[PDB]
């Protein structure tokens, strides 16, 4: 009985309350789920090509503004004139510009050199960036085939190749596939096989931050389990430098003097930044490393401002308050903000007033104001991603970067409040009781204002166990070319010589699960960090360290040509047969298929250790009597495993003796029939 | 409390059920809410304006 319904009533509490707790946490993970940063990515002005090099740039206060590029074939002679109003002339005499955006790898991807020539550098500098951000995460880039992974890349139309009405001489049809912001996300989704929503956003100087905002929305609603968020402004032709001189907004030195009295223009720089975004639960469940956590982000427009280019104050306050409100955080929870800091004499005052309004009005500690453009320059559509890169690197190193050219704080901004502290010196930012939080603001010339809130990664990674083992896990590394293989050995050797003390099994595990299986494979089983570094330097020079190169070309549209003529050396053993699921399934299927007419089993010959079978070895072309049945069984198994292990084949044919062999993998057989 | 055994805790049923209904309705209005087409503006070939 139920004590006159007391059990029934209270038990219905115990389900309704539990369901409410589940549904409200579903509200929380569906509206304010803290999405984490898995890997970092950047090709920023100067020598920056990796996030660690960008931190080396920020920590020592180096400015990337050096000068105009010369690899691009720029005229550079009509680009300037004593008359500031001359058509065809720019005003800034430099700016931080990429020295490697001119070059791209066609052969690495499924791109022809003819195609890659017409590819917009912005897109070329997203294919490589997506690859390298996937590697850095410990996630094999080729393992994300036909998987939900949204792409959000911000760009700037500008102009790169010839007129599309006039076409070209070598490039005719792939000029579309290059000079379109559209395919600047579709390419990445296609080469990497990503099935997630491929959106290429375009919101001027805030495109990257907008893209990360949308990626946050996609993950919070759950449309894509993974998100590809980033932005870029490659600088192919000097036209936009010429015409941003026409309204007299470019700083003649090309430097972003953010919040400085010497701000004589907002300058300009070209760069690229990219992020991996996804919900923290999916991170810590899947084991993906968490660099930082992006809690809340808002996107708004300036409205009817003093023109399309002029910023708005109230709209900026609204966006940087709405980001906090949607993040569940506030002005007092942010220890250091990353403002736009475009560098113009007009945007900076209103921007700092907005910062003082949303944050400075109620501050317990002075807010540390910083600007990545001071060290880099205004990266336009790559601004907002560079800011979050700077803040996440400050998280991971526990130090606030300097804001260059900010010693003389702007006289047009009221700093007497003291709630905002300009980051003219490196301020330590150690982990403490307060969760370290940062904010990135980007205000595009289109008027779209965006702001995001970056909380430190929850320090739950600590607690890892330590042990030792005799397992000499092979250091497997693969590339798309022999020179790429030699360079992948050399860079790994340089990393292990500049970052010593990394345990060999950790290195092997990172090289194995996180580096894709590329069609040029060199591997070795190290015993010591010296014997491993010697092998790495040997592969770098190009000698035979194991005499083993796993060669191939592609995986898509594979036709399974089946030539015989002797292969499939008997070199299997215990555990090996049970490492691959489809491999073992096919071997056991071939085992169980022949009951009535055959009784010999290949598994005892396979699972037998081959360390003792290497002293009487012979070539596979003269042992056809014994090798051929093994050829047939292992050929069935290997065809079945290579059908789906990262390969999307198109058909199967037979070059020689692989005809009935691939007919038996077409079905239409029984026990007796297959045996016969 | 007074007769039977449930006139203070059934109120807890009522409040919890209302809250759960309002939360699931929030779920369906944030992920399944119909979005109305207020008006339509087009410029299309053939003189369509």
């Amino acid at each position, epitope marked *: 009985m139920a004590s006159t319904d007391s059990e*029934k009533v209270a038990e219905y509490l115990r389900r309704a309350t539990l369901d409410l707790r589940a549904a409200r946490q579903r509200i929380r993970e569906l509206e304010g789920e803290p999405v984490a940063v898995v890997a970092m990515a950047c090709r920023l002005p100067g020598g920056v090509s990796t996030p660690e090099e960008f931190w080396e740039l920020l920590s020592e206060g180096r400015d990337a503004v050096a000068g105009l590029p010369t690899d691009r074939g720029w005229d550079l002679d009509s680009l300037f004139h004593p008359d500031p109003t001359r058509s065809g002339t720019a005003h800034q005499r430099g700016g931080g510009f990429l020295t490697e955006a001119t070059a791209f790898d066609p052969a690495f991807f499924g791109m022809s050199p003819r195609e890659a020539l017409a590819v917009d550098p912005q897109q070329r500098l997203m294919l490589e960036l997506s690859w390298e951000v996937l590697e850095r995460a410990g996630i094999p880039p080729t393992s994300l085939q036909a998987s939900p992974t949204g792409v959000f890349v911000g760009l700037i139309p500008q102009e790169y190749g010839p007129r599309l009405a006039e076409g070209g001489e070598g490039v005719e049809g792939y000029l579309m596939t290059g000079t379109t912001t559209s395919v600047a996300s579709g390419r990445i989704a296609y080469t990497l096989g990503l099935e997630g929503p491929a959106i290429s956003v375009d919101t001027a100087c805030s495109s990257s931050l907008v893209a990360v905002h949308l990626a946050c929305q996609s993950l919070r609603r759950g449309e894509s389990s993974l998100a590809m968020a980033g932005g870029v402004t490659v600088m192919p032709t000097p036209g936009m430098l010429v015409d941003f001189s026409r309204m007299n907004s470019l700083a003649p030195d090309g430097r972003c003097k953010a919040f400085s009295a010497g701000a004589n223009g907002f300058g300009m720089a070209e760069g690229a930044g990219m992020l991996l975004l996804e919900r923290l639960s999916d991170a810590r469940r899947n084991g993906h490393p968490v660099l930082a956590v992006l809690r809340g982000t808002a996107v708004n427009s300036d409205g009817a401002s003093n023109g399309l280019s002029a910023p708005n104050g109230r709209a900026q306050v609204r966006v940087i308050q709405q980001a906090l409100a949607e993040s569940g955080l506030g002005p007092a929870d942010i220890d250091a903000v990353e403002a736009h800091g475009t560098g113009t004499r007009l945007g900076d005052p209103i921007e700092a007033r907005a910062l003082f309004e949303a944050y400075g009005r109620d501050r317990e500690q002075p807010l540390h104001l910083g600007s990545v453009k001071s060290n880099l320059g205004h990266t336009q559509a790559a601004a907002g991603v560079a800011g979050v890169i700077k803040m996440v690197l400050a998280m991971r190193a526990g130090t606030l970067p300097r804001t260059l050219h900010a010693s003389e704080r702007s006289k047009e901004i009221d700093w007497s409040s003291g709630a905002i502290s300009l980051l003219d010196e490196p301020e330590p930012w150690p982990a403490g009781a307060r969760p370290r939080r940062a904010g990135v603001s980007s205000f595009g010339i289109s008027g779209t204002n965006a702001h995001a809130i970056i909380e430190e990664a929850p320090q739950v990674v600590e607690g890892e166990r330590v042990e030792a083992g005799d397992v000499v896990a092979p250091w497997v590394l693969s590339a798309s070319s022999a020179e790429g293989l030699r360079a992948q050995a050399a860079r790994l050797a340089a990393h292990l010589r500049e970052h010593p003390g990394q345990d060999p099994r950790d290195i092997a595990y990172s090289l194995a699960t996180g580096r894709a299986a590329l069609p040029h494979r060199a591997a070795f089983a190290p015993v010591d960090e010296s014997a491993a570094l010697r092998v790495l330097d040997g592969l770098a020079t190009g000698n035979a360290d194991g005499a083993a190169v796993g060669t191939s070309r592609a995986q898509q549209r594979a036709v399974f040509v089946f030539p015989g003529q002797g292969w499939q050396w008997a070199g299997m053993a215990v555990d090996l047969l049970d490492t691959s699921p489809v491999f073992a399934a096919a071997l056991r299927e071939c085992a169980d298929a022949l009951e009535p007419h055959l009784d010999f089993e290949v598994i005892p010959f396979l699972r037998a250790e081959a360390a003792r079978r290497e002293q009487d070895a012979a070539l596979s072309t003269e042992r056809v009597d014994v090798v051929q049945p093994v050829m047939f069984a292992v050929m069935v198994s290997l065809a079945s495993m290579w059908r789906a292990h990262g390969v999307e084949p198109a058909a199967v044919i037979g070059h020689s003796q692989g005809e009935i062999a691939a007919a038996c993998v077409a079905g239409a057989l029984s026990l007796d029939d297959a045996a016969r | 409390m007074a007769s039977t055994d449930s006139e203070k805790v059934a109120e807890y049923l009522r409040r919890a059920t209302l809250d759960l209904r309002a939360a699931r309705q929030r779920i369906r209005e944030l992920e399944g809410e119909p979005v109305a087409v207020v008006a339509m503006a087009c410029r299309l070939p053939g003189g369509v304006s």
Partner: antibody
Amino acid sequence: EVQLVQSGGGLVQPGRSLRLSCTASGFTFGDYAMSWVRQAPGKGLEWVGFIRSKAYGGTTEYAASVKGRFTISRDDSKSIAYLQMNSLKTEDTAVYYCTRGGTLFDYWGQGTLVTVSS
Amino acid sequence: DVVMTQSPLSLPVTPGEPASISCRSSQSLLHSNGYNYLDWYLQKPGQSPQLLIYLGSNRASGVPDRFSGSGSGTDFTLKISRVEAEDVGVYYCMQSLQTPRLTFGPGTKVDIKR
């Protein structure tokens, strides 16, 4: 999360005892009242009995067909539920379920084959 | 006396169509608290069942919101908006006004319409 995983399946003949244990993890065990249901093979479930929570205290109900045969006990420190078979007969040949509530069987374990065959 | 509860049995459902299962009660299951005391369960063929609806209309968590239900003081209706390939099994219209609950009802083994 939650799991009321069971254990104690086996093959017995009528007239002896059998063990059924329900592992509780992911929640406070003394808050929910354990119940046990039996599923005859190929046809509908037919309930067995339940025990009330310690804070409530209460008593134990069993089905009219298991009076004086089956008993249920519970504990918080080890958080394992107990369904006891004594003097088994043929009708007990069925898969039993561990249910998470006296009247709301809001969670259900996988089920263990309790077979009493001759 | 014991409440006589017999849902209409044998409701085949084919994927992509709206179905609806009713249920019977001898006397009213609507208590003085204004709430119904009948529960809705679906028996997996092959493993454990799960909860669809309690209070007669209040749905449980975990299961999708497709399992909608309502009812009058006596008449009840687990009114299932649609079914799919996995929505096949045995639905139990169990009451909760009179402990013991005992059997879960003969049960509504439901299948694919054809």
